[PDB]
Design a protein around this motif. Structure first.
Motif, PDB file in Angstrom:
ATOM      1  N   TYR A  33       0.843  -1.187   0.000  1.00  0.00           N
ATOM      2  CA  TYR A  33       0.000   0.000   0.000  1.00  0.00           C
ATOM      3  C   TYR A  33       0.882   1.241   0.000  1.00  0.00           C
ATOM      4  CZ  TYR A  33      -2.898   3.748   1.810  1.00  0.00           C
ATOM      5  OH  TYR A  33      -3.532   4.952   2.002  1.00  0.00           O
ATOM      6  N   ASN A  41       7.577   4.544   1.279  1.00  0.00           N
ATOM      7  CA  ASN A  41       6.862   5.512   2.100  1.00  0.00           C
ATOM      8  C   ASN A  41       5.604   5.960   1.370  1.00  0.00           C
ATOM      9  OD1 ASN A  41       6.231   7.157   4.220  1.00  0.00           O
ATOM     10  ND2 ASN A  41       7.854   8.663   3.851  1.00  0.00           N
ATOM     11  N   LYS A  66       3.364   8.072   2.677  1.00  0.00           N
ATOM     12  CA  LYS A  66       2.979   9.431   3.056  1.00  0.00           C
ATOM     13  C   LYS A  66       3.206  10.450   1.945  1.00  0.00           C
ATOM     14  CE  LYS A  66       4.326  13.160   6.186  1.00  0.00           C
ATOM     15  NZ  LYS A  66       2.928  13.483   6.588  1.00  0.00           N
ATOM     16  N   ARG A  97     -15.462  10.820  17.942  1.00  0.00           N
ATOM     17  CA  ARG A  97     -14.347   9.978  17.545  1.00  0.00           C
ATOM     18  C   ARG A  97     -14.282   8.725  18.411  1.00  0.00           C
ATOM     19  NH1 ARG A  97      -9.829  14.575  19.226  1.00  0.00           N
ATOM     20  NH2 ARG A  97     -10.567  14.864  21.372  1.00  0.00           N
ATOM     21  N   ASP A 152     -12.867   9.423  12.798  1.00  0.00           N
ATOM     22  CA  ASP A 152     -11.575   9.886  13.295  1.00  0.00           C
ATOM     23  C   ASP A 152     -11.384  11.323  12.832  1.00  0.00           C
ATOM     24  OD1 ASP A 152      -9.245   9.816  14.677  1.00  0.00           O
ATOM     25  OD2 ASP A 152      -8.277   8.266  13.461  1.00  0.00           O
ATOM     26  N   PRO A 210      -7.303  16.179  15.587  1.00  0.00           N
ATOM     27  CA  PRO A 210      -7.054  16.267  17.031  1.00  0.00           C
ATOM     28  C   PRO A 210      -7.573  17.567  17.621  1.00  0.00           C
ATOM     29  CG  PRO A 210      -5.014  16.475  15.763  1.00  0.00           C
ATOM     30  CD  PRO A 210      -6.063  16.001  14.817  1.00  0.00           C
ATOM     31  N   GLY A 211      -8.181  17.491  18.806  1.00  0.00           N
ATOM     32  CA  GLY A 211      -8.666  18.647  19.526  1.00  0.00           C
ATOM     33  C   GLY A 211     -10.175  18.705  19.665  1.00  0.00           C
ATOM     34  N   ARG A 264       3.796   5.683  10.354  1.00  0.00           N
ATOM     35  CA  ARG A 264       4.096   5.196   9.010  1.00  0.00           C
ATOM     36  C   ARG A 264       4.166   3.675   8.981  1.00  0.00           C
ATOM     37  NH1 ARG A 264       8.952   2.391   6.668  1.00  0.00           N
ATOM     38  NH2 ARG A 264       8.983   3.006   4.464  1.00  0.00           N
ATOM     39  N   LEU A 309       0.684   2.351   9.246  1.00  0.00           N
ATOM     40  CA  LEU A 309      -0.041   2.667   8.024  1.00  0.00           C
ATOM     41  C   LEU A 309       0.327   1.707   6.904  1.00  0.00           C
ATOM     42  CD1 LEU A 309      -0.715   6.266   6.826  1.00  0.00           C
ATOM     43  CD2 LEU A 309       0.151   4.625   5.180  1.00  0.00           C
ATOM     44  N   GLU A 330      -4.925   3.083   7.584  1.00  0.00           N
ATOM     45  CA  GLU A 330      -4.759   4.351   8.278  1.00  0.00           C
ATOM     46  C   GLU A 330      -4.127   4.075   9.629  1.00  0.00           C
ATOM     47  OE1 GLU A 330      -9.101   4.780   8.597  1.00  0.00           O
ATOM     48  OE2 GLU A 330      -8.748   5.794  10.511  1.00  0.00           O
ATOM     49  N   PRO A 331      -3.514   5.089  10.250  1.00  0.00           N
ATOM     50  CA  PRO A 331      -3.028   4.910  11.624  1.00  0.00           C
ATOM     51  C   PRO A 331      -4.140   5.088  12.645  1.00  0.00           C
ATOM     52  CG  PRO A 331      -2.257   7.010  10.718  1.00  0.00           C
ATOM     53  CD  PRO A 331      -3.218   6.431   9.720  1.00  0.00           C
ATOM     54  N   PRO A 359      -5.719   5.411  16.304  1.00  0.00           N
ATOM     55  CA  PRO A 359      -5.173   5.886  17.589  1.00  0.00           C
ATOM     56  C   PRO A 359      -4.978   4.790  18.624  1.00  0.00           C
ATOM     57  CG  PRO A 359      -6.845   7.391  16.783  1.00  0.00           C
ATOM     58  CD  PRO A 359      -6.888   6.199  15.875  1.00  0.00           C
ATOM     59  N   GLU A 415      -2.860   8.404  25.167  1.00  0.00           N
ATOM     60  CA  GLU A 415      -3.548   8.598  23.887  1.00  0.00           C
ATOM     61  C   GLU A 415      -4.056  10.031  23.784  1.00  0.00           C
ATOM     62  OE1 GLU A 415      -7.055   5.844  23.896  1.00  0.00           O
ATOM     63  OE2 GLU A 415      -8.195   7.719  23.797  1.00  0.00           O
ATOM     64  N   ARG A 432      -2.840  12.690  21.075  1.00  0.00           N
ATOM     65  CA  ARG A 432      -3.558  13.621  20.212  1.00  0.00           C
ATOM     66  C   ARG A 432      -3.118  15.059  20.462  1.00  0.00           C
ATOM     67  NH1 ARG A 432      -7.787  11.466  23.236  1.00  0.00           N
ATOM     68  NH2 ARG A 432      -8.577  10.467  21.335  1.00  0.00           N
TER      69      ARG A 432
END
Lengths: 1340, 58
Positions: A121, A492, A494, A934, A1039, A1042-1043, B30, B33, B39-40, B42, B53, B57
């Motif tokens: 992937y 990679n 990303k 989430r 998901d 963050p926050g 990575r 993933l 996907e990663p 959490p 955790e 975040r």
RNA sequence: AGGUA
């Protein structure tokens, strides 16, 4: 014949039958992405090309090479619907087969070991929807195809700037598909220069020196040798009798031993012909003629090797004597003619400071990078990678084919990297053009501009991602192990995925789909942009590109483009045009045999079009392709003219092929000005969907095609019988001959209902079919927004009268009857989105709750115990939707506040209200609530309820499908069981789930019963696994970034009605703003008494040149008259026969009409169906230029028992007195544009200020004030406007202290100002002082 | 070079040990993933670190 | 980014 057509047959005019059905309007995007994603067994466009270009990747020492095998697209984890719901992209995982091979360590190549990583992937690529779009963040985006200069060679003319010399020049640009540009330009001194990219020009011979070419080699390759035999006295020369053109006699022209042309004479064609027929071999020439010649090659002594002549010097007496005495006999000089190959290369060599490859490399390396001491290896590497590196320079197939085309080679393929031969050919062509033999090529011809569709752009960006990951891989192959290690740990994902997402999401050519019309979506997907990465910046005009070029005919719509500062840059692709194999635009043409016009088609590209002569689509043909005019109008070389009917080579396929869908939908376009037609076509895309979207009476025939081809209409993929009709679901029982082997079952269509578009407009699909209706493939099951009966229905057809009415319709204004709002027509639904995010702040996590401190109980009333408003509650501006509260921090109290809290006993609240209120000015019903919490964060009650709702919805759908399938299974189980011994008495009375408990004797029937029992078990497992799989998606949270702890999305549906201020227009371009909605009585009314719904200013017609609106109005009278007559017949309910006769006469009425007649329909049901569909009027189709004529319109009006002139005298409503002379009334298709006055107000007296400045602006709830720019300051200065100007500048703009003092004074009831100082000026002072500059304020 | 990237490349100050924690988190992200291929998540990020955790975040 | 004057 389509049953959808049977339900409503639009009367189509047009005397020339089309031989080519309208192509699938989205074929461009679909074919582009299919080429991008589909596997290729050879080097071809798409991912395969990029992979084979970048792979295999070779390690920098280590003999560890990475080889590509294939790629596989994983099935997307979420479908389109849940992707839009959840706000996540609709994408497919990309998995690639790779192998790491380690060779002999260390020895010549040859594999020793190999390991394979399967389906690694390396990122997720957005997958294309069936509507031709992509979903990236819950918003449906479109990648606009780009029009950009094609890779290849352009021989352009430099004009308008001449280095103070005149004599406009020529320059050849080699534009690679990927790599560095190359330029060969001229100077007014007749010298040739090379520019890599746009750096400083070098003499052109330097590139040849770097290509390892001797001066004599260059002269041989460019100039023609002239032979000089050293004989008699001072040499004779071998004269070709064809060589002497345009020369004066400076030498005795001898032939057969005697001179024919004496010195000083003018040589004409007579002397030339005499010399040619006399075949002159050699002539003696005087040394004076020799002294101006140039020696081509080097010459040394033949007995002692002394250098006496070298390459490229002028000849002279001493040099001639030296070469004669040395022992030479043959001298090769350069042929230099001022009309033939001129002194370009010779003088360029003279200017050349270098004479070898090394110095040329030094010069190239220094011009490309300033200074940078020219290391020989570095210069060699730079030169090789500039033009000969496949991973750094590429032309691609299109570039190579154009390269060979402009150099006139039969090859159409070859290596992407340039070769020395190609460069030399480019020089020769440019020199010939300089000599006048060649011709320049336009940079605006569509043959020189190629269209990069979605697939090519995506492939190029993916190639860039592959390049960066290649850098990473090559670093890793030496940094990491040089022996066995699993290759998935060194690739990679990303960078590639991040860059692909950057392209698809945030780019100049990735736009939110303009989604307020099916036409808008079609136009956006068909849009052609000259902007974007690698195209043209808006720093243009630059009239050339913005101007319409004669090649655009039939390829690009010339009359559709925005009026902003990008006009002529954002075009729309024509109706019939399609992208060529190489990316150019090709349009279909009917092949024309000398006598007969064949029905076969050929898609001609831009360059191919010029070669042949093409007949206009207006040519009248009788029988099998025979012209009626001996001389017919055609176009051959871009110029229209009359040609005899025996030389025509192609004909236009249809009269509508010179426009786009937006332009083609305008009726009577032939009767409208191009400017106003452009405005109308631009506005037609801005129509807002209407609740009562019925149809356009005066159509063009593209309505059905646009509605069907756009994704907004639910079209039956496989025909059959409609089994179930519901506002949300349509279930079709497929026909027997269309089901797959085994049990294929039903086809289910879920109808998208009341979903937010990208323009905050409602898009819902209503079922236009009923139970038991037989449907076939391509039928319209459900009508989408702005669509009815499968026709495109943007606006509404309304009765309009062209007359001034007390000046309410003054400039371009519209007057509208109260009947319009009473009929609830032009009433749009705006579904806007609101988001309340419960975040996690350092003061404490935010929470959503019903109990809000210090709020009214009315706010608490509309929320549940979870703090979320109930679905369906009516809310207005300022009402609380989400009960968000934020942990209140430390509180500072003024002395008065402390006194008051001491008095009342109250204390500061530990939590501050942060609840999401409705922005003021909007209203409506909460139709949908989305809750995203989430994973890993506790769920609340409302989220659980919503998850249960969707879970049970999916469960119901699955249960319906399963019960139909198992009912079929049990029916065939009974059929098998009854066979082989009668068992139909007891079985019939037993429940169908108890039908597998009956045994049978050993037979084929028993084995079949066992197999079907196993199938029943398998179906149970299939149901269970499907339920589990979808429950995993439903249950899991989203998901988020963050926050944010939770997100609450609320949909508000505003039933926004038509009112004064809203912008309303027509298709022809007539515009305006509704002035006042008068009561129905005030409308002028006809003799029958029908008041006219809309009143238009007639003065806007004769000055806007758009007479087409008048013809549309007359045709609307005709159509609505036919409708009124058929409605009267239906109310009178005469019989099937009378209605059928009248409809047949209506369809017949015309001239050479291609409509086709009845009876081919059903006797009674279909006739009444048509009558009920037409009682509101008979829709009329007017092709764009094959439209109805005045005679046909008048005949149709006569059939409707209406005045022939199309004007009826109207009685005023106010006075009840008829106007002098009749007034034009008729049913015109009018459009409500997305410029509603409700959105256009913003007003403020206090609100959002700014940080760096104090200028008031900001907020999507209440905006800033209006920019009082320098123009308005000038306007005030023009008057003696001083105090008003000071208010504009200080009190209300930037003086915070003055602003507060003014507010306090006005509240207190006092009107005076503190001049103060605007904060902007103090900012200016501080910022100037931030430099090394002193600025101060000094008193007197 | 690592010190320079930690200090002069971040607009807001981030401690060097925090920067190293971020780099470890990104490397493990990575890895997860490319292993899971989707996907990663959490949860796995929390499992790999000693870090709860919510700190992950933040 | 697209659209309006």
């Amino acid at each position: 014949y389509s049953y959808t057509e049977k339900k409503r047959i639009r009367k189509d005019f047009g005397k020339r039958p089309q031989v080519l059905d309208v192509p699938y309007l989205l074929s461009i995007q679909l074919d582009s992405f299919q080429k991008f994603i589909e596997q290729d067994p050879e080097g071809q466009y798409g991912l395969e090309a990029a992979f084979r270009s970048v792979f295999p990747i070779q390690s920098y020492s280590g003999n560890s090479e990475l080889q590509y095998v294939s790629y596989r697209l994983g099935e997307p984890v979420f479908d389109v619907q849940e992707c839009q719901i959840r706000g996540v992209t609709y994408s497919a995982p990309l998995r690639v087969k790779l192998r790491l091979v380690i060779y002999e360590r260390e020895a010549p190549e040859g594999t020793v070991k190999d390991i394979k990583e399967q389906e690694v992937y390396m990122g997720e690529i957005p997958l294309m929807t069936d509507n031709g779009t992509f979903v990236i963040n819950g918003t449906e985006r479109v990648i606009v195809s780009q029009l950009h200069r094609s890779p290849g060679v352009f021989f352009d003319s430099d004009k308008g700037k001449t280095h103070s010399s005149g004599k406009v020049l020529y320059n050849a640009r080699i534009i690679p598909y990927r790599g560095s540009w190359l330029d060969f330009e001229f100077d007014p001194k007749d010298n040739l220069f090379v520019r890599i990219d746009r750096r400083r020009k070098l003499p052109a011979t330097i590139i040849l020196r770097a290509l390892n070419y001797t001066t004599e080699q260059i002269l041989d390759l460019f100039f023609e040798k002239v032979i000089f035999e050293i004989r008699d006295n001072k040499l004779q020369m071998e004269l070709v009798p064809e060589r002497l053109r345009g020369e004066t006699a400076s030498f005795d022209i001898e032939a057969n031993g005697k001179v024919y042309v004496e010195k000083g004479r003018r040589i004409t064609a007579r002397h030339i012909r005499q010399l040619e027929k006399d075949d002159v071999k050699l002539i003696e020439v005087p040394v004076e003629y020799i002294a101006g010649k140039v020696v081509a090659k080097d010459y040394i002594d033949e007995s002692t090797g002394e250098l006496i002549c070298a390459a490229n010097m002028e000849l002279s007496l001493d040099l001639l004597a030296k070469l004669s005495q040395s022992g030479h006999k043959r001298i090769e000089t350069l042929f230099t003619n001022d009309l033939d190959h001129g002194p370009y290369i010779s003088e360029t060599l003279r200017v050349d400071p270098t004479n070898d490859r090394l110095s040329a490399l030094v010069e190239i390396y220094r011009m490309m990078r300033p200074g940078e001491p020219p290391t020989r290896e570095a210069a060699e590497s730079l030169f090789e990678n500039l033009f000969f590196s496949e991973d750094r320079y590429d032309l691609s197939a299109v570039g190579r084919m154009k390269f060979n085309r402009s150099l006139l080679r039969e090859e159409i393929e070859g290596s992407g990297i340039l070769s020395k031969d190609d460069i030399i050919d480019v020089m020769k062509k440019l020199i010939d053009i300089r000599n006048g033999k060649g011709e320049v090529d336009d940079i605006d011809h569509l043959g020189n501009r190629r269209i990069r569709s979605v697939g090519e752009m995506a492939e190029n960006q993916f190639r860039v991602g592959l390049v960066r990951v290649e850098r990473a891989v090559k670093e890793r192959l030496s940094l990491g192990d040089l022996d066995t290690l699993m290759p998935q740990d060194m690739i990679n994902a990303k960078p590639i995925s991040a860059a692909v997402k950057e392209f698809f999401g945030s780019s100049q050519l990735s736009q939110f789909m303009d989604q307020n019309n099916p036409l808008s979506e079609i136009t956006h997907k068909r849009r052609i942009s000259a902007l974007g990465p690698g195209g043209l910046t808006r720093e243009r005009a630059g009239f050339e590109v913005r101007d319409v070029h004669p090649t655009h005919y039939g390829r690009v719509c010339p009359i559709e483009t925005p009026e902003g500062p990008n006009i002529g840059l954002i075009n729309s692709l024509s109706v019939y045009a399609q992208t060529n194999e190489y990316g150019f635009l090709e349009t279909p043409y009917r092949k024309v045999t000398d006598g007969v016009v064949t029905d076969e088609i050929h898609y001609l590209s831009a360059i191919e079009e010029g070669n042949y002569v093409i007949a206009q689509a207006n040519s009248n043909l009788d029988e099998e392709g025979h012209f009626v005019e001996d001389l017919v109008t055609c176009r051959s070389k871009g110029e229209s003219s009359l040609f005899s009917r025996d030389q025509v080579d192609y004909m236009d396929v249809s009269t509508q092929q010179v426009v786009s869908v937006g332009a083609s939908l305008i009726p009577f376009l032939e009767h409208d000005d191009a400017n106003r037609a452009l405005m109308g076509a631009n506005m037609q895309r801005q129509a807002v969907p209407t609740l009562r979207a019925d149809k356009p009476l005066v159509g063009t025939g593209m309505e059905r095609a646009v509605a069907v081809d756009s994704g907004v209409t639910a079209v039956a993929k496989r025909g059959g019988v409609v089994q179930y009709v519901d506002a949300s679901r349509i279930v079709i029982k497929v026909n027997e001959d269309e089901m797959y082997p085994g049990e294929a079952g039903i086809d289910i269509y879920n109808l998208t209902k009341y979903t937010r578009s990208n323009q905050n407009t409602c898009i819902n699909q209503m079922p236009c079919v009923s139970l038991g209706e037989p449907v076939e493939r391509g039928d319209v099951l459900a009508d989408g927004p702005s669509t009815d009966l499968g026709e495109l229905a943007l606006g509404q057809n309304m009765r309009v009268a062209f007359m001034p009415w007390n000046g309410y319709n003054f400039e371009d204004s519209i007057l509208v009857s109260e009947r319009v709002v009473q009929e609830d027509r032009f009433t749009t639904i705006h579904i806007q989105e609101l988001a309340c995010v419960s975040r996690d702040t350092k003061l404490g996590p935010e929470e959503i709750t019903a109990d809000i401190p210090n709020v009214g109980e009315a706010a608490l009333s509309k929320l549940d115990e979870s703090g979320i408003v109930y679905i369906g509650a009516e809310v207005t501006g300022g009402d609380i939707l989400v009960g968000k509260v934020t942990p209140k921090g430390e509180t500072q109290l003024t002395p008065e506040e402390k006194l008051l809290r001491a008095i009342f006993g109250e204390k500061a609240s530990d939590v501050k209200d942060s609840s999401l209120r409705v922005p003021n000015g909007v209203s409506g019903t909460v139709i949908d609530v989305q809750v995203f919490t989430r994973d890993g964060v506790e769920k609340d009650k409302r989220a659980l309820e919503i998850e249960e709702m969707q879970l049970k919805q999916a469960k119901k759908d699955l249960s319906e499908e399963l019960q139909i399938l198992e009912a079929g299974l049990f029916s065939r189980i009974r059929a098998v069981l009854v066979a082989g011994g009668v068992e139909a008495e007891k079985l019939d009375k037993l429940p169908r789930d108890r039908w597998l408990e009956l045994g049978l004797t050993d037979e084929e029937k028993q084995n079949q019963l066992e197999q079907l029992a196993e199938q029943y078990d398998e179906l149970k497992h299939e149901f269970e696994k499907k339920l589990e799989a979808k429950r995993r998606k439903i249950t899991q949270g989203d998901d988020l970034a963050p926050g944010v702890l939770k997100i609450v999305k609320v949909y508000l549906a505003v039933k926004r009605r038509i009112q004064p201020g809203d912008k309303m227009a027509g298709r022809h371009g007539n515009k305006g703003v509704i002035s006042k909605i008068n009561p129905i009585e005030d409308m002028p009314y006809d003799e029958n008494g029908t008041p006219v719904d809309i009143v238009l200013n007639p003065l806007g017609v004769p000055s806007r040149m758009n007479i087409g609106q008048i013809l549309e109005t007359h045709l609307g009278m005709a159509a609505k008259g036919i409708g009124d007559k058929i409605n009267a017949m239906l109310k009178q309910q005469q019989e099937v026969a009378k209605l059928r006769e009248f409809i047949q006469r209506a369809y017949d009425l015309g001239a050479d009409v291609r409509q086709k007649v009845d009876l081919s329909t059903f006797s009674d049901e279909e006739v009444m169906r048509l009558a009920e569909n037409l009682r509101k009027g008979m829709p009329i189709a007017t092709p764009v230029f094959d439209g109805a004529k005045e005679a046909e319109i008048k005949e149709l009006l006569k059939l409707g028992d209406l005045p022939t002139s199309g004007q009826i005298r109207l009685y005023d409503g106010r006075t009840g007195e008829q106007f002098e002379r009749p007034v034009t009334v008729g049913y015109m298709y009018m459009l409500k544009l997305n410029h509603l006055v409700d959105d256009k107000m913003h007003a403020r007296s206090t609100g959002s200020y700014s940080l760096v400045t104090q200028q008031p602006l900001g907020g999507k709830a209440q905006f800033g004030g209006q920019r009082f720019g320098e123009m308005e300051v000038w306007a005030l200065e023009a008057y003696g406007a001083a105090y008003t100007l000071q208010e504009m500048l200080t009190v209300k703009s930037d003086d915070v202290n003055g602003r507060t003092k003014m507010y306090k004074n006005i509240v207190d009831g006092n009107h005076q100002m503190e001049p103060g100082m605007p904060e902007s000026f103090n900012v200016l002072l501080k910022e100037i002082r931030s430099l090394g500059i002193n600025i101060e304020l000094e008193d007197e | 070079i690592t010190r320079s990237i930690a200090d002069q490349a971040r607009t807001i100050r981030i401690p060097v040990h925090m920067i190293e924690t971020i780099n470890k988190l990104n490397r493990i992200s990575r890895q997860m993933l490319q292993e899971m291929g989707r996907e990663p998540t959490p949860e796995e990020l929390a499992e790999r670190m000693l870090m709860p955790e919510d700190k992950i975040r933040k």
